[PDB]
Design a protein around this ligand. Structure first.
Ligand SMILES: CC[C@H](C)C(=O)O[C@H]1C[C@@H](C)C=C2C=C[C@H](C)[C@H](CC[C@@H]3C[C@@H](O)CC(=O)O3)[C@H]21
Ligand SMILES: [Mg+2]
Length: 182
């Protein structure tokens, strides 16, 4: 059918410049691969606050992933995940911003630490949520369990834990083998 996909990427202070970059490159790889498909994209950066780097309308209008994310400025603050999510839910998946009413709403969260806030994600009930946790902060099984609450059930299917940002490349290779013409 139609897939409206939003990348919710972590731009906290824990990230080294090169790690932030690998996050941006992953997003561009996926978008470059699925260009001219049924997929529509939007990108939202989160730390303390939230910024929509580009919405579904910009994507359709300019279509170039490199131009779309060219002026992203790393925020360097905390990780307010609950707020970031309801923000997407309520401010990004909006028709005025180019979201298609008959589209499946998928949300891919990319983070490197646990959440520095709280609340609930009820506004995001009908959104498919994948969570990609990367790095040292998710070494313990205990810290990996904190992500389960932002992701769709079953977590083993929706939560991805990578030990290095180098692994995001291996994740893209794994994504590519599931690409099929229907
Ligand atoms: C597909 C395997 C890769 C590693 C992956 O998980 O990509 C997931 C997670 C992430 C690596 C990027 C994605 C980009 C596009 C789609 C939404 C993809 C999930 C596609 C699957 C296939 C159907 O069951 C629909 C669905 O809900 O999820 C995600
Ligand atoms: Mg962090």
């Amino acid at each position: 059918g139609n897939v409206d996909l939003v990348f919710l990427f972590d731009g906290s202070m824990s990230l080294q410049p090169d790690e932030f970059q690998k996050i941006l490159d992953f997003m561009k790889d996926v978008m470059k691969k699925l260009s001219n498909t049924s997929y529509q994209f939007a990108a939202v950066q989160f730390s303390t606050s939230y910024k929509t780097e580009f919405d579904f309308s910009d994507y359709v209008k300019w279509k170039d992933p490199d131009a779309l994310l060219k002026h992203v400025k790393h925020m360097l603050l905390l990780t307010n995940t609950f707020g970031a999510i309801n923000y997407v839910a309520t401010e990004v998946f909006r028709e005025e911003l180019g979201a298609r009413p008959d589209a499946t709403k998928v949300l891919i969260i990319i983070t490197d630490g646990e959440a520095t806030d709280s609340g609930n994600i009820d506004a995001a009930k009908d959104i498919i949520r994948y969570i990609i946790g990367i790095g040292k902060h998710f070494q313990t099984k205990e810290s990996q369990e904190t992500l389960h609450k932002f992701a769709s059930k079953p977590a083993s299917e929706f939560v991805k834990i990578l030990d290095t940002f180098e692994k995001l490349k291996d994740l893209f290779t794994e994504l590519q083998k599931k690409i099929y013409v229907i």
